[PDB]
From a paper:
Fortunately, the RT/RH domains of [name] [name] exhibit weak sequence homology with [name] virus type-1 ([name]-1) RT. In particular, a consensus sequence present across multiple regions (i.e., Motifs A, B, C and D) that creates a dNTP-binding site (N-site) for [name]/[name]-1 RT is significantly conserved. We therefore newly generated [name] RT-mimicking [name]-1 RT mutants by substituting unconserved N-site residues with corresponding amino acids in the [name] RT sequence. Here, we report the acquisition of 3TC/ETV resistance using [name]-1 with three [name]-associated amino acid substitutions (F115Y/Y116F/[name]) in the RT N-site.
We determined a total of four ternary complex structures for [name]-1 RT3MB, including RT3MB:DNA:3TC-TP, RT3MB:DNA:dCTP, RT3MB:DNA:ETV-TP, and RT3MB:DNA:dGTP, to a resolution of 2.51 Å, 2.56 Å, 2.32 Å and 2.30 Å, respectively. Our ternary complex structures reveal that 3TC-TP binds at the N-site with its triphosphate moiety in an atypical conformation compared to the natural d-isomer form of NRTIs/dNTPs. The α-phosphate of the d-isomers lies closer to the 3′-hydroxyl of the primer DNA, whereas that of 3TC-TP occupies the position farther from the primer 3′-hydroxyl, and is instead closer to main-chain Ala114-Phe115 residues. The conformational difference of triphosphate between l/d-isomers leads to the spatial replacement of α- and β-phosphate oxygens coordinated to Mg2+. Despite this significantly different spatial arrangement of triphosphate, the Mg2+ occupies an identical position, retaining an identical octahedral coordination. We noted that the side-chain of Asp110 (chain A) in RT3MB:DNA:3TC-TP was flipped and did not coordinate with Mg2+. The [name]-1 RT3MB:DNA:3TC-TP ternary complex revealed that the thioether moiety of 3TC-TP oxathiolane lies closer to the Met184 and ribose ring of the 3′-end nucleotide, and consequently the side-chain of the Met184 is moved backward, as in the conformation of Met184 observed in the RT3MB:DNA:ETV-TP complex. In addition, another cell-based study indicated the 3TC might not be incorporated to DNA differently from the AZT, a known polymerase chain terminator. The bound 3TC-TP conformation clearly indicates recalcitrance towards incorporation into DNA, and thus 3TC appears to be an N-site blocker hindering the binding of substrate dCTP rather than a chain terminator. Our data also demonstrated that HIV3MB is approximately 4-fold more sensitive to 3TC than HIVWT. Tight binding of 3TC-TP observed at the N-site of RT3MB may explain this result.
Residue numbers in the entry:
A (entry chain B): 5 to 213, 231 to 427
B (entry chain A): 1 to 553
Write the structure that this text describes.
Amino acid sequence: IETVPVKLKPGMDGPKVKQWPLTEEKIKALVEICTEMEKEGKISKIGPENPYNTPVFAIKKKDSTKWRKLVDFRELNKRTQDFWEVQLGIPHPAGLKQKKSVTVLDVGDAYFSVPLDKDFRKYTAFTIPSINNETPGIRYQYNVLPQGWKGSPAIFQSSMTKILEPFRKQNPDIVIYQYMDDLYVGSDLEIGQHRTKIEELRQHLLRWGGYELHPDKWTVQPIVLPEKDSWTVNDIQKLVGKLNWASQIYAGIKVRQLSKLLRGTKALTEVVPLTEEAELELAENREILKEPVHGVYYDPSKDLIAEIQKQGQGQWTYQIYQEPFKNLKTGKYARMKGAHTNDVKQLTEAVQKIATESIVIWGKTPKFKLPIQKETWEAWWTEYWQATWIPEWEFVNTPPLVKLWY
Amino acid sequence: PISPIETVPVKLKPGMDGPKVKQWPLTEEKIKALVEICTEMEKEGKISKIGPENPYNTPVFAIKKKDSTKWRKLVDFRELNKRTQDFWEVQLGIPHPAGLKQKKSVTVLDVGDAFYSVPLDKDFRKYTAFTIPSINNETPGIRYQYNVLPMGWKGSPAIFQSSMTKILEPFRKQNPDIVIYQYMDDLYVGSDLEIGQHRTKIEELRQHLLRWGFTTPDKKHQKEPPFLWMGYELHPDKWTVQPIVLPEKDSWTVNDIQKLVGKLNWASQIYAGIKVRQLSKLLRGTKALTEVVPLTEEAELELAENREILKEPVHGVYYDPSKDLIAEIQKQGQGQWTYQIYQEPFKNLKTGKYARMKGAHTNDVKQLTEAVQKIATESIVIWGKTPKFKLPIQKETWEAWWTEYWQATWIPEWEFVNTPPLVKLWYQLEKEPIIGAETFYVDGAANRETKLGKAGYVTDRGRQKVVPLTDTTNQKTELQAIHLALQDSGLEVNIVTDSQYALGIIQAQPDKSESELVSQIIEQLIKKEKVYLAWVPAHKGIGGNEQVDKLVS
DNA sequence: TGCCCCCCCTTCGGTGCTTTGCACCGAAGGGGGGG
Ligand SMILES: Nc1ccn([C@@H]2CS[C@H](COP(=O)(O)OP(=O)(O)OP(=O)(O)O)O2)c(=O)n1
Ligand SMILES: OC[C@H]1O[C@@](CO)(O[C@H]2O[C@H](CO)[C@@H](O)[C@H](O)[C@H]2O)[C@@H](O)[C@@H]1O
Ligand SMILES: [Mg+2]
């Protein structure tokens, strides 16, 4: 078959990103995986005269118990030409977030039956390290549509439609969405009933070449205010600064008649009685925050942003937005790991969960603002990653002024 | 001889042509050195004569070699390197002897004439044009081009390395229980075969290299311990660094101190407890490498301590993969940490130190976490796994940090070890306001354009103060306002500020800072008994904050 | 009067913030070491 001509964006060069260190077991797996891929002509040994590189690592799903090679093509995807520009992109269906259950299938291997523009292959190089630098790195590049490259779903688009038409034909109320190497397949069938056409969809796929999500319990978590019999100056100061923040989000929240209960230079522990007109202000403000904000709509032409705060005892709050203070979703992630002993694992799992929700809902992952030092994240995150995609992220140091989201 | 391996295709960067540079003068001993090498290089096919049809040029020289009575030929390809395409370098790191296993039989070989045994892409050769001068009198020179990898060209190390990997790969696959450490042209070869079979494998590997054009001179074939390797000495059961000679000087320049610090950092991989904070402080704010710097008293002490450590002989041991790796860290003061990695007690694989200051404001618990991260990365590089940690911090201290600090943080499986000074939080902010403690409302403002400002407070007990400030900033006056509240309050205090900046720093429980002002605040926080610190928004007429904001103007 | 790699310590300059300095970060200068 014929390559599809592919280009970088104008005036950009290919990725040049250093390989990071890997454990013994990940290097062994990469050497087993790449050796076999070399033999099947999917990749080719290259040398140092190719000046491009992209980091490679491996993930092992606990249920699968087998390694999965993951090449971090984030840099390459940013520099690759848009395909919605050429109109080869994958439409998002609004029905997916409606379904009772959604299973994720890794279908990256179907990409390996389509060859890649020979002029583009050099941009796909990667380098396997060696323990104690016993040897120089070993380098490959792809001859086929790579896993993890945003061009592969787009180029393979015409084909997976043909592969899936009978299944969709036969199951009109199951909805299937392709995102990168993944198929998101949702339905309303009973919990163990849904699983079985999952397994049938598999056989139709294994006849050319995660764990059940449940969206209708992706509860939103709004801003709430404490309820008490008696209120300190400090309580009312904390209450006033929290509502003042929230008036950047909601309309007509007012502080004038809680703020003057604090007229005077008063002790933080003095108990100030609530006036009739402060009780009014507060129960009023309590419901403006009761239901969602009026005037906030998704824009597919703009990026999604996600913020997370650590709250403690295994809880993590998050907000997804595109314009500041216009949240499309606010949530609370709760760790179920067990011991409650690992912040980095909890955050890594929270990022996968949030990103998965954005895929199901809007069809793309958000750029994360992560509440962690860069070097703490980079020491550990790959040990807990289980997705075939990797979102954009950046690192922030923002103390809480208010505890808005508790 | 020249390898029959395929050449590596190489390109100039797009738009670029080749270099055009005149040659300079060299001594008579550095023309005979090269002509001996140059008509002999031509005899072996390494270079060929060119003339005026090729318009490119690049100058040439020679330098002495540690091996006495051999010279190293070099061409100054700085211009060509600029116009030559980028490479992805395959040397990702440096092997370390603590990552080696014990082996019954060991050999170390060098490949001779390494670069000159690898051919250069046909179409690129003409860009390597040069000229040989001959004293600069009565002859201009004759022109050659390289047919093999030139020393001084940007692509030569990578194309040699990659070529060597392709040549070795058949042999490694054939003998999987022979470890070959390949660094440039240097080959370490270990096995568990009796020395008989081992030497069979060796000369078999030597013959494989020779069919591909790579000699292994006997001069550099090491057969007996101790082997000289990568700057170390390999004994059967242990390894040493080759001797480290520190400068000793009556008068010191910046550049001398720079040399001294570098030697000590190199020593610190096996000599426990090395410190360089006070010697490196001398380098700050200087402005010439020949500037004489007098050692401070603290630097002399630190130098003398390091000198005592260096007089004592040390050795590392090799890696036993059937035992855990263990990493133990000690605190040295002024943001300095030293560590040891071992498997059996008092038998170090290696040592090291961590002493970077990350951030304007930090504490010992964060820096301990950074040391742990640096050790974890180094262990992955050398041994492919992370170690069990032994740390001088209590479980309670750590647990109070990751509950009170708002960023995700972690450290792996660790056991407390009592080696004072222990790492500890130096104060903790109260989660709730303190009954009976005075309430200070603080504020500071500066004038953007003037440099002038004020810091002050008012109090629920009627106390109030305003101090003038000169040559300051907005953020400084806010820090200053908190400084005064702490200075004038008792052992327990409640503080309300409108600076999220100041709250941000202090809520992170810093114990050191590059700021003298923040340092002064830290010493006051450490002397207090309880402190609650609260924020309110500015300019919303809030009781307390409004009155002090009123007062600062 | 050269090349490539790793490390540490210091300086400098670009980025973004409901900023007007400040904190962060990557690159580049010096040094060590390897070939
Ligand atoms: N100062 C240096 C040292 C080494 N090199 C490179 C790194 S590896 C390669 C080795 O060159 P050669 O083997 O031909 O000469 P050697 O000095 O090693 O002796 P022999 O091995 O006896 O042939 O030269 C360099 O470019 N600059
Ligand atoms: O974690 C950031 C760190 O990772 C690298 C890869 O080594 O960059 C990756 O992550 C970035 C943040 O989303 C992407 O912008 C980038 O394209 C991707 O390779 C480093 O470059 C970066 O320092
Ligand atoms: Mg040699």
